[PDB]
Amino acid sequence: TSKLVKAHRAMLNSVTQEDLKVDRLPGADYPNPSKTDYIMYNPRPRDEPSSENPVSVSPLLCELAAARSRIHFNPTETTIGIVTCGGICPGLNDVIRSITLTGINVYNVKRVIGFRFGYWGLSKKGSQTAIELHRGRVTNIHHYGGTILGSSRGPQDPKEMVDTLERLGVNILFTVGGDGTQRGALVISQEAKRRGVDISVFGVPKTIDNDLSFSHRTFGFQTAVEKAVQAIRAAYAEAVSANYGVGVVKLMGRDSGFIAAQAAVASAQANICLVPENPISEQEVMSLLERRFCHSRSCVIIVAEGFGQDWYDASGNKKLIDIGVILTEKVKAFLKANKSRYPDSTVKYIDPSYMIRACPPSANDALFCATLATLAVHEAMAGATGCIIAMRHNNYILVPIKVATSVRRVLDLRGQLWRQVREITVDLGSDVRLARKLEIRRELEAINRNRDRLHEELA
Amino acid sequence: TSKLVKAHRAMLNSVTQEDLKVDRLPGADYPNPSKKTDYIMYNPRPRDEPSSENPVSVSPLLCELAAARSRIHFNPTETTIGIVTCGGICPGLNDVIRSITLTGINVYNVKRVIGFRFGYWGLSKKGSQTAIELHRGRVTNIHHYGGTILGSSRGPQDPKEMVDTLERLGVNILFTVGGDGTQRGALVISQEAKRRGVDISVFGVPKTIDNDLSFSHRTFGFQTAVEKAVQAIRAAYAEAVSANYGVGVVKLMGRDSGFIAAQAAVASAQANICLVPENPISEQEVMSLLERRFCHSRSCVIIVAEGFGQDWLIDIGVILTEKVKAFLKANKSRYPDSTVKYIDPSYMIRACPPSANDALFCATLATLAVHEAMAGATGCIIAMRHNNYILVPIKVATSVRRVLDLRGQLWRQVREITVDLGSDVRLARKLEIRRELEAINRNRDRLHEELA
Amino acid sequence: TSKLVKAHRAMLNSVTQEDLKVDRLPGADYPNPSKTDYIMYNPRPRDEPSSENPVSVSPLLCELAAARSRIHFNPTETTIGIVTCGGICPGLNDVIRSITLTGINVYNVKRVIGFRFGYWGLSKKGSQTAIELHRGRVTNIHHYGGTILGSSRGPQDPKEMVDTLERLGVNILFTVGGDGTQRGALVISQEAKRRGVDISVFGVPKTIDNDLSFSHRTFGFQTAVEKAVQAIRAAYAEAVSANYGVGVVKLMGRDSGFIAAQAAVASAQANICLVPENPISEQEVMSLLERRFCHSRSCVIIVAEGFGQDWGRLIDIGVILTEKVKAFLKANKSRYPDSTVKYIDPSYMIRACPPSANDALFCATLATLAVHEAMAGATGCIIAMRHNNYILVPIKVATSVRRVLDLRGQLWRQVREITVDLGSDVRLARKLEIRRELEAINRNRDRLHEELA
Amino acid sequence: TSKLVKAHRAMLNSVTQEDLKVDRLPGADYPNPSKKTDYIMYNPRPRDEPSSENPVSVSPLLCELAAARSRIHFNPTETTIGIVTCGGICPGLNDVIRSITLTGINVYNVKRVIGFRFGYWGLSKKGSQTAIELHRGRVTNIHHYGGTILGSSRGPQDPKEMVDTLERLGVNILFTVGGDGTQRGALVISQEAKRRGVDISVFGVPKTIDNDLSFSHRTFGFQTAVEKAVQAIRAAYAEAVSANYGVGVVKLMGRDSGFIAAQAAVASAQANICLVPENPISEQEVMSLLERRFCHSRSCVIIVAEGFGQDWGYDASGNKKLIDIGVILTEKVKAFLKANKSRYPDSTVKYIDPSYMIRACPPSANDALFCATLATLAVHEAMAGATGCIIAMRHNNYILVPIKVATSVRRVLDLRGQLWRQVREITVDLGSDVRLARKLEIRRELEAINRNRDRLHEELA
Ligand SMILES: Clc1ccc(Cn2ccnc2)cc1Cl
Ligand SMILES: Clc1ccc(Cn2ccnc2)cc1Cl
C-alpha cells in the first residue's frame, strides 16, 4: 500500500476500493425532515502536469459524509443509543451532547438512551443503569471533561447487548471508543445482522493519540497538545531551577507519538524526545543526556508511554510498562554513577496524563466534536452501519470498521514535523566545541553592535 | 464557479495552471547545509464514479508543494534575511518572526537577519535608520507574547526607496508578513528589484485572522482568534442572561469573511443571531429575529462581523447597538425593563500570544517559507491546503478570496442554533414543553421509587 | 474620624461605638442544629510598648461574625429569601449557592426562595417570577458569572416588598448589591419592624471597586484585578506594535481606583494611571504622554471610569480621553508623525466571569457566615472582611463612609514608581541609564570572552 | 504556645516583647534618596467589652511595621545587594528576585546587585564563581515565569565560606529567599558576619507555599497554589466520576500545615475526604469514610496533604524525611477495594501528583503584586539597617519578625475554625445514618419539581 502500519489484530492484509464500501442498511424510504459523493485517498498526481487533468497516485476513493435527501430510519419512530468506552478524553460530553441534540432538534427522534459505564451498560445486569438524554440533561455537559454516561474498558457478551438493544427499541447505537470498542461494535453489527434486526452500529473514533488511519485529526487531539505543552512548561521551570536538573514528562502515545512530537516542537523546551516510532537503547538516551550536560545545566525529556516497552494485552489493546517511572530511575542511577562529573544533580518525573484527558475541549476541538457527531447522526439516519466518521483533507468521510482497525498511523520519521523535533533536540552528530564556538561568535557580534549604538546615543 | 469570490483589485480575471507556476530565482548552485518540485491537486474530488483505473481531479489545477530542497539558490553563509510585519496585529506574529530568524541562523547558518521596524515605513530612507539585528538572544522568548517586536504600520511606501534600502543592507531575502495589501506591495518590490536585475527573493507569510485566504483552509492566528471570540461570547451571554429582556451585541472579526463569527457562534452555542457579510439583511430583519427570540426567552446574544451592514468603514457594532436600543425604547410597551450591552473584544483577540496549535503552525509556516526562499522561491506566499503546505503566486492569492458557503455544513450548524422565523413558534414551543414534561415525569417517578 | 471619606447621602456625620451596635431580632430560643465577641477597628497602639498591654488609637470595637450556640429563628420552620441587585460581578452565583446550601444542608431550613431581577422580583407584579432554590438548582451555578436569579437597578415600593415577604413566609431576606441596594434593605428592615413582622434583612456587599468602608476586601475584587491585568497585557501588545502607539484601557472605579492601582502595579505595563482620588487637567495628561514619547514609542494609560467627571460639555471618560489624546496627537503631527490611539473597554470580560478559586472560597465564607448570623437574629447589617476577620456592620454606618486610595500609601508609591515622572530631567536620567546598560553589557562581553577555552 | 505550635528545633520556648525587637545595624546617617518606627498589635482582640475607655489587646505583643524610612543606614550609590533563592521552587520566585533588583537599582540607585546561583552553594568558594549581575535588562520579564533564574538548592553550606564570598564581593545586604531552614542558616551568616564586625544586613523573604509561617496570614505563592490545586481536583473528579466505584487520590502540599488541602477542598467543593497532618486518622478510619461514600455515590475524591499519615511506612537534612503518603494511600485503597470486590465489583483508583504544576508556574496577578510589595518593602527596610529578620503580612499590614522568633513557632489549621467547619460541611460525615437518619436529605428536589411541572402545564392556555 503506502503510508500506514498494519495493526496487531488487522482483519485486512491490504485495502482495495471494495473494502472502502460503507454498509448501508437496506431501504431509504423516509425523507430527511430538514447520491453518495467521493474524495480521493491521495490527492497527489501520478504524472507531471500535462494537457489533461491530474490522476491520483492511489486508486482509493473515500465516501464523503453528509445529510442525505433520503433517510432509511423513520425519525419520530427511532430511538438513538450512545455508549462511551475506554479512558476519558477531551470533548467526550461534546460528542454525547451533539448526538443527543442532532437526533432531538434536527431529526426529532422518539428518544435518546445513554448507556452507563461503557459496554457494561448494555449487559442485562447494567442495562438497568441506562439514562434518558433530553435537552435538559445535556444542556451544559460540554463545559466539562470525562463523560456523564461514564465509561469502562473491556467487552461484554454480544448477544446480551443486542438483547438490550431490541428490548429498548434502539434503532441506532453510537460507539464512542478506541480500536477495541469499534471491533466490539462490528461484533454487535454482525450479531444484529445474524438475527436480521434493523439496528445501525456507528463508531465515533475516540483516540487522543490521533493514530487513526484514514484520519488527519481525531477529537481531543488539539486540546491534548495544548495541555501537554503546559505540562512541559512546568517540567522545564522545575528542571531549570536545579543544577544538573532533569525533567522527565510522560505524554500520550501507545502506537504513535504525535502528541510527544507536536508538544516538543510547540513548547520548544524539549532536549530529548522518545517516541515508539524511534526506539533507542538506554545508553543512547544517557549519551544524549550526557551531551546536553556538556553545555547546559538543564535537560527536559519528552517520553511517549508506548516507548521502550522492552526495558501483556488486556481486552483489545496492550499492557504497557510504566516507561515514565523506569526512565526516571534509569537516569537517577546513571547520575548517581557519574556523581564525579554531575556532582549535585536532581531528576523530576511528571505524569500529566490526568490533566490532559480529564478536561473540557479547546473551542476548536468543541466545534470539531459537534460536527463529527451531527454528521454521524445525519449518516446513521441514512442507514450507515459498521463504519466510523473521520476527518481527511478538510473533509468528513465514512470508513468501514474492518478497514480502520486493520491499519494505524505513525510519525513519518523523514517528515517535516520530526525534522522540527531533531532541529531543537540534542544531536550527537554535532561537535559541541565547534558548535558552541560559532554560538558565542554570533552572541559577541550582536552585543558589540549594541555597544556601538549606545556609544552613539551620547548626545 | 466553486467557493471563491473575485477580489476587489484582482490582478487575474481567471486562474490557469500557468498562473500557479511559482517564480524561481535563476540558479540552484549551493547544497542545503541540512540534509525536483512535487505537486498536490487543487480539488481532490473525482470527475467520474469509482471505475477500474485511478480517479481524476474535477479541476485541472495542480499546486506546488513546499519543502526543504536538496539544492538551494542562495549561498547560506553569504545571505542576509529581512523581515517586516505590516497591518494590524494578529496572534503569533512574534512566532513567525522567531521561526524565520532561527531557521535562517540555526538551520541554514545565514550571515545575518534584519528586522524592519513598523511595517514598510522601516524600509523607507527615513525609517531604515530604525531597523534592528535579529540574533538568537533577541527572539529567545518573543513567541510567548502578542503583537510584533518589529512593530507594524498600514499603507505603502515608495518601491524604489525600499529596494534602495534592501540593496544597501545586502538583504538577499525579504519576508513580507501582512494581509492582501502587504503582499500586493511585495509583488511591486519583486518587479522593481527584477527591473534593476538585483538577486532578491520577496516571500509572503499571509497574515489574516479572518482566514479568508484563497488556496488556504487555515491561516496562522485563526484558531486562537476563535478560542478568544468564544470567551467574549461567554461574557456577553452571562451579561445578557442576568438582565430581563437583555441583549448582548458582540463584534467579532470579518471584513470580507465571517469565518470567526460562524465558528465562534457554533462552538459557544450561545449565539441567537449571527450577522456576517456573506448574508446581508435589513435592520427590520434583525429586529424581527430579536422580537422572535423575546417571544420565548428573556435573553438574546447577537454575533456581528465588523464587515456586516456596511450600508447602514463603519462601526457596525456601535450602529447595531444604538439601532436595537432605539427599537426596544420603541416597544417599551411589550419589552418594559430592557438592557442592551455592546462588547468590542477586538483587542483581546488580536493582541495575544497564539494557542500551542497556532504556535506550532506559525513555526512550520515560517521554517518552510525559509526552506523555499533559500531555494529561490519569490513573488509567492506559503499557505495550508488539505493537510499540505503549498506555494501560491501572489498575483493569484490577491485575485480571489474565501467566504462562507451559505449552503455549507458550518452555516447549517449556525442556522441550527440561531433564531429561525421559518419555524411556527406555537407548534415548536408546544413540542418543546411536551418533551420537558415527559422528562420531568420520569424524574418524578424515580424519586417516588426512592423510598428504599 | 480620619482615613475614610463621607458618602454623598451619608446617614451619619461620624461613627460612635453605639452606631456599631448590630440590630438583633428579639429572642434566641432554639439551639444551632450544628456571647458576642469583638475585634478593634484600629489595631494600632496609642502609646509605645510600656509595662501594660497596648490600647487602640480608635475607641471603636467591631462585632465578629460566627455561628452562634443559640439561634433566634426555628430552623425547620424558616424560609430564606435571596435577591441580586445592580450590575453583575464575579462570584454572584457563588454567594447564591453558599446561602442556599448553608440554609438547606447546615440549618435544614424549610425552603429557599430566589427573587428574579433584583427588587422588581419582590414587587407584586414580579413576585410571580420568583423560584425555588433546592440543591439540584444551584449544583454548578458557581462555575458561571452573573446571576441565575438575574438583577436590575433602582428601587421598588418597600410596602409591596414586605407584603411579598409576609405572603411567602420569608423569615430572612439576603440583599446582594451595592450602596443603593443596602440602603433599600434598611428601608425594608424599618418597614417590617413598623409592622412588627419577624423578618431579618441581611446585606452581602457587592462592590467590585472594593471601596466598602469597614472592609479591606469585597467578593469579586481579586478576580477583577486578574482580568484587568490581562486586558492591560493586550492594550500593551496593541500599543507596542505601533510607532507612537497609545493604549487607553478603562478599568472600574466610580469612587475608588483600587482596581486601576493594583492592576497598573501588577502588570507593570502602565505608563499613566488616572484615578478619581487624583483628578488632573487634560494638559497634565497630554504632558505625561509627551514626556513618555521623548524616550519610548509606546504609552499605556489606565483610566478609572470615575476619573475626569468634569471634562464633558458618569460621562464615558474612556471615549472622551481617547478622542482628546487623538486630537492632541493630530495637533502635534509635526513631532509625532505617524501615531495610533487604541481604546479598550474590558468592563464586560471583568464583571461577567466566574471567580478565581480564592474569590470563590471568599464568597462561600461570606455567605455561610451571613446565614449563621441571620439565623441568630442579625438584621439591618452587612458582613465584611477586616484584618483577616469577618465582622457585622450596621447598614446606616456602611453607607455613611466609603474607602479611597491613600495617595501617600505604599500602593500609590509603587504606581508612581513605574508611571512617567515629570520630576526626572530626561537628558540626565537617560545618560545615567545608558551608563548602567553599558556596564552590564561589558560584563556579559567579559564572561563570554572567558567561555572561550 | 496558645494559637501557634512550637517548631521542631525552636530557638525560643516562648515570645516576649523583647524577642520581637528587630535588629538594626548601628547608624542611620544617609537620607532616603526617594523624595521613627511604628507598631501594630499582634492580637487586635479586646480584653474587656466596649466600656468607657479605649479597648486593650488580649496579648501584650506589639509588631514593628515595615515601611520606607526617612533615614537609611547604608549609603545607596556605595551599596551592593545580594540575592539567593533556596529550597523547592514556588510561584513568584522570579517576581521577588525582580522587585528586589529593580527597587535597589531604580529607587535607591545601589552600585550593583549580585544573584548567587543554586541556593547557598552559590556563596561557597567552589560555586561563588557561578554568581551573576542582576541589571534591569536581565530581570525585565523573568516575573512572567516560574521557578528561579538564579536557580536553587537544598541544605546548608559553611557559614565562614559564605561570609568570605560576601566580603570579597562587597555585598552590604544579602536577601535569603527560602523556607524556615534557609532563614535559620541566614541567622548563622548574620552572627558570623557580626563575629567578624562586617557591616552586612541579612534579610529573609519567607518562601513557603504551605502558608504555615507564624506572625503571617499570607506568604507569597499561596493563593496561586490554591488556584492550581483546585484545577487538579477538577481533573481528579472528572477522572473519578467517569468510572463506576471510581476513587481519585490527589496529593496537595502540606508538610506541617494542610492550608492548601483545606482551602482547595472547600473552593472546588469536589472533596469527599480531606486528610491533613493536623487531624491524623487510622487507615481503617479512611477506608470507613470511603465505604460510607460508596453507600450513596459511585464516586469518591480524596485530598491528602504530603505530611499526613507519616507513620503508615528519623530526619535527614531539613525538619524530617517524608514517606510518599500519596502512593501508600493509593495502594491501601486499591487493596481495600480488591478485598471487597464482592460489594464494589468493577472499581478504579487514580493517583494524581499535581505537585509539579503547582510549584513550577508563574503567580496569579494578586500573588505577583504581593511578591512585588514584600520585596520593595524588604529593600526599603534593609537599606534602613534591618537585619536577622523576615518580612510577613498580618492583618492587612507588613511587619518585620526576628528570624529567631519566626523559626520557633509555626501555624496550623484550627480544627474548630470556620475553614475546617466548611471542609467537614462538604466531606463525608459518619454521623449521618445507614438509612433511618440518612433519609431526611432525599426530600426537597421532588417537592420543588412538581411545582414547576404545574406551572409548565399552565403555560399551554
Ligand atoms: Cl477509534 C480507532 C483508533 C485507532 C485505530 C487504529 N489503531 C491505532 C492504533 N491501534 C489501532 C482504529 C480505530 Cl477504529
Ligand atoms: Cl495575505 C492575504 C489576505 C487575504 C487575501 C484575499 N483577500 C483579498 C481581500 N480580502 C481577502 C489574499 C492574501 Cl495574499
Residue numbers in the entry:
A (entry chain B): 10 to 43, 55 to 331, 338 to 485
B (entry chain A): 10 to 44, 55 to 331, 346 to 485
C (entry chain D): 10 to 43, 55 to 333, 346 to 485
D (entry chain C): 10 to 44, 55 to 332, 338 to 485
Give the text the authors published on this PDB structure.
The X-ray structure of this complex shows that the di-substituted phenyl group fills a deep allosteric pocket adjacent to the active site, and explains the ubiquitous presence of the dichlorophenyl pharmacophore in hits from the HTS run. Based on the X-ray structure of CTCB-12, a number of derivatives were synthesised using pyrazole and bicyclic scaffolds, including imidazopyridines, pyrazolopyridines, thienopyridines and pyrrolopyridines, and tested against an enzyme inhibition assay and an in vitro parasite killing assay.
In this stage of its life cycle, the parasite mitochondrion is highly compromised and cannot carry out oxidative phosphorylation and T. brucei exclusively uses glycolysis as the sole source of ATP. The carboxyl groups of the two Asp residues hydrogen bond with the F6P substrate and also coordinate a catalytic magnesium ion, facilitating transfer of a phosphoryl group from ATP.
